């Protein structure tokens, strides 16, 4: 199943999340890991990120529905988060 991972965390923890998810999917560009994993696959993925610890800001996408999200990221309203 088609999974796009967006990491909004902060270095050097951002490189640690890049280490785990880059061991699972390819690096498409600018902290975005596109690929495909299954339900058991994302189960091992999320238990590895819960073994990572605090400060991890991960939003997964299966198509458009958000499958899971770790961290205190205020994804306001329906689909996006700009700031300025």
């Amino acid at each position: 199943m088609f999974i796009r991972i967006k990491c909004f965390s902060k270095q050097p923890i951002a490189k640690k999340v890049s280490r785990e998810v880059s061991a699972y999917l390819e690096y498409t560009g600018n902290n975005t890991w596109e690929g495909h994993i299954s339900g058991q696959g994302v189960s091992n993925l999320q238990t590895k990120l819960i073994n990572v610890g605090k400060g991890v800001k991960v939003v997964c996408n299966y198509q458009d529905k958000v499958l899971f999200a770790i961290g205190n990221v205020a994804m306001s309203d329906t689909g996006s988060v700009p700031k300025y």
């Binding site: 458009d64 529905k65 958000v66 306001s76 329906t78 996006s80 700009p82 300025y84």
Partner: protein, 289 residues
């Protein structure tokens, strides 16, 4: 200078709650009390409905009106709105509409057509679950609506018949989705919150289909004591009970918040292009002649 994206291929719809809507750097957006802008894709935006504690400025209203994004004010009930009027509408649609509409029999014919397309809305749009295509109660209830609107003796005979329908259908889905909530504007539970945040999507899709193909709202097809607001209610019942109600009961039972509700409704609207769909179905009424 590009053809300005005709209304049938605009895709984004929103309700704005507890915000401030303006223009930042040629981009329409809104702000929370910590900034956090949410730049509105105005080339694809249908509408912006505004809840309490909200406002929109003139330059934003003009920039959304040049492409024609309809702004309304949500506080069923009286909803106030602003239709873009600088852009000159295609004449033949509302010309044929008013020529039929001042005749009372053709007014009845137009009203029975637009209210009878709710069955077409329920049969064309199909990616549901739970009750799904029928629970042996909702098919009978659209059948009884078909009977009531095929009756159609007078305009005030069914003046609040859809009010009884939103009552009976908010109780009818609730016997399989376990809560005993009722139709109320101030009930603090999640079910009435979801079904009060839902009718404004019907209002907005109805409004921006009423913005360039055909009719300005105050020439309506449902008037009476309790039907206050005009034609936008009449063309919003099409996706009131067919679309937002099953996803509302889904989101209220499986228990997430407002945001993933609006995520699911935006997905449902984009999967079938219901803006485009009800554009070309109100084209069948304005361009019948």
């Amino acid at each position: 200078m590009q053809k300005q994206i005709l209304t049938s291929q605009k895709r984004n719809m929103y309700i704005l709650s507890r915000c401030k809507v303006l223009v930042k750097n040629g981009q329409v957006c809104h702000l929370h009390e910590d900034g956090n802008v949410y730049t509105v894709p105005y080339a694809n935006t249908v509408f912006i409905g505004l809840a309490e504690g909200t406002s929109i400025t003139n330059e934003a209203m003009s920039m959304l009106a040049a492409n024609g994004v309809i702004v309304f004010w949500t506080k069923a009930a009286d909803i106030i709105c602003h239709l873009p009027q600088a852009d000159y509408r295609p004449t033949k649609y509302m010309q044929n509409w008013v020529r039929l509409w001042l005749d009372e029999e053709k007014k009845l014919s137009a009203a029975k057509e637009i209210l009878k397309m709710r069955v077409d809305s329920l049969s064309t749009h199909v990616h549901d679950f739970g009750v799904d295509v029928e629970n042996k109660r909702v098919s009978s209830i659209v059948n009884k609506f078909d009977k009531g609107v095929t009756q159609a003796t007078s305009f005030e005979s069914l003046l609040g018949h859809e009010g009884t329908f939103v009552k009976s259908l908010y109780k009818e889905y609730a016997l399989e989705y376990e809560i005993e909530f009722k139709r109320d504007h101030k009930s603090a539970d999640n079910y009435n919150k979801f079904l009060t945040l839902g009718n404004y999507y019907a209002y907005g899709i109805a409004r921006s289909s009423l913005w360039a193909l055909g009719i300005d709202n105050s020439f309506p097809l449902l008037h009476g004591s309790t039907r206050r607001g005009g034609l936008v209610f009449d063309v919003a019942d099409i996706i009131k009970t067919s679309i937002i109600l099953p996803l509302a009961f889904h989101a209220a039972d499986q228990g997430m918040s407002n945001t993933e509700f609006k995520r699911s409704c935006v997905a449902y609207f984009d999967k079938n292009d219901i803006l485009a769909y009800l554009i070309n179905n109100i084209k069948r009424l304005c361009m019948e002649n």
